[PDB]
Amino acid sequence: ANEDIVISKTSLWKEMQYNRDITIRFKFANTIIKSGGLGYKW
Amino acid sequence: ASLIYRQLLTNSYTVDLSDEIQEIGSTKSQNVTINPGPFAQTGYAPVN
């Protein structure tokens, strides 16, 4: 190791909290995969 | 012979024209305002 270099000069940043109403719509899904055999196994 | 002093003073408005001639040939540049002040000290959040 023992190395590190500068990329760019200093920059101006600030902290800000964003409050937002979010609606969440997510439908589940099922694999339901059939294994081998006569068809009884999964 | 004092006419030289009198005319040098009188015909001085042409100095402005010479200045404009120099200015047009001068290279121009612009500067943006510098964000001043005692910037607030904000560091990393407490993490684990």
- Note whether A12 contacts B42, CB cutoff 8 Å: no
Give me the resolution in angstroms, 1 decimal. 2.7
Nearest CA-CA partner of A14 in B44, B40, B47, B38: B40
CB contacts, 8 Å: B39 with chain A: 12
Of the partner residues B35, B39, B42, the one whose CB lies closest to the CB of residue A15: B42
CB contacts, 8 Å: A15 with chain B: 42
Query: What number of CA atoms fall less than 13 Å from residue A3's CA on the CB side?
Result: 1
Nearest CA-CA partner of A15 in B39, B42, B46: B42
Nearest CA-CA partner of B35 in A18, A7, A9: A9
